[PDB]
């Protein structure tokens, strides 16, 4: 076979240890999921420093806790922009999931609260910037560099999916690079606890699995498709279904044959064909052997999965850090003052937050 007796025994034992870890992780998650925390700070506890990113509902800002001096990233959502039914439900998903998870590559939530106008989530500040801007600046990552990030995503999805959580918005914009060069997944705005299928048409066009575009009930396999898109984009510098307008992107995803750069290794192309697989009975991550079809693939043969989890592997890139509160690794955005209305807005729609 491909493995000798000693290697096969080591791998089997490793796989059983993963099961033991995930069972304990589910016990810890469920305690926090059934007993969430709320209103653990208020706005005047923080000095607001700089906008780090913007979205449709608000912005993420670097803030400084006044009493402790610690820096944090504060996501601010304008309740009156979170108007559509699925926008509201997704915001409650995001907070409840973030407060309950615990994994080395998932951003840690510190506080959450709300006022008359806004919802706030205060998380650990990750100063190395988004993978997105490092990737666009350098062009593409070499295969070993892409593989180091990909392995962290595989482990993070194995963790999330074991808790019945689907992530649904994988992309470089959502992956921050910490001081040791490891990834922090942020932005849980589309994550959801799903025990079988779900039906919301949501995500980012280039990263949508065909079954989402086709209005089919879908499952956690959409995250494995998205991993294929991410690995392709990291290694090529552009994603596999690439067009100016969303409708053109969708047509390529459902009906397009993926083409690969001539510099992709055959091992990489083989992995990507099996992740970017339209047939759900054939997509890696969705078969009887689950995540192990990915972890045991030839492209990952050099990956020490336990060492990645334990953060024992030297990262390919360490961001320059000029001290606490440095924002040099983030792009600049237009600043707009936070206005808190004298009247409560959308109080009933956000009771649970």
């Amino acid at each position: 076979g491909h493995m000798g007796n000693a290697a096969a025994a080591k791998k089997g034992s490793e796989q059983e240890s993963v099961k033991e870890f995930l069972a304990k992780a589910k016990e810890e998650f469920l305690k926090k999921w059934e007993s969430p925390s709320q209103n653990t700070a208020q706005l005047d506890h923080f000095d607001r420093i700089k906008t780090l990113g913007t979205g449709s509902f608000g912005r993420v800002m670097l803030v400084k806790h006044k009493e402790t001096g610690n820096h944090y990233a504060m996501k601010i959502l304008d309740k009156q922009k979170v108007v559509k039914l699925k926008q509201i439900e997704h915001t409650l998903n995001e907070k409840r999931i973030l407060q309950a998870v615990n994994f080395p590559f998932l951003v840690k939530l510190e506080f959450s609260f709300k006022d008359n106008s806004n919802l706030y989530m205060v998380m650990e500040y990750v100063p190395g910037g988004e993978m997105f801007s490092h990737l666009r600046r350098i062009g593409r990552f070499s295969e070993p560099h892409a593989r180091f990030y990909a392995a962290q995503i595989v482990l993070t999805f194995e963790y999330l999916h074991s808790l019945d959580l689907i992530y649904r918005d994988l992309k470089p914009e959502n992956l921050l690079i910490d001081q040791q060069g490891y990834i922090q997944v942020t932005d849980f705005g589309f994550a959801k606890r799903v025990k079988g299928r779900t039906w919301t048409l949501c995500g980012t066009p280039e990263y949508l699995a065909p079954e989402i575009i086709l209005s089919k009930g879908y499952n956690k396999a959409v995250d494995w498709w998205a991993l294929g898109v991410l690995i392709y984009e990291m290694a090529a510098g552009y994603p596999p279904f690439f067009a100016d307008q969303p409708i053109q992107i969708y047509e390529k995803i459902v009906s397009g044959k993926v083409r690969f750069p001539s510099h992709f290794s055959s091992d990489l192309k083989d992995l990507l064909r099996n992740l970017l697989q339209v047939d759900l009975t054939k997509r890696f991550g969705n078969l009887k052997n689950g995540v192990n079809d990915i972890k045991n693939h030839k492209w990952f043969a050099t990956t020490d999965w336990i060492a990645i989890y334990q953060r024992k592997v030297e990262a390919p890139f360490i961001p320059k850090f000029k001290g606490p509160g440095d924002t040099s690794n983030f792009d600049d955005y237009e600043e707009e003052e936070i206005r808190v209305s004298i009247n409560e807005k959308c109080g009933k729609e956000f009771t649970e937050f």
């Binding site: 449709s56 997704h90 552009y238």
Partner: peptide, 13 residues
């Protein structure tokens, strides 16, 4: 030709 800047995620439609 395709989108090179940051990409917004869509909640609906």
């Amino acid at each position: 030709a395709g989108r090179t800047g940051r990409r917004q995620a869509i909640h609906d439609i």
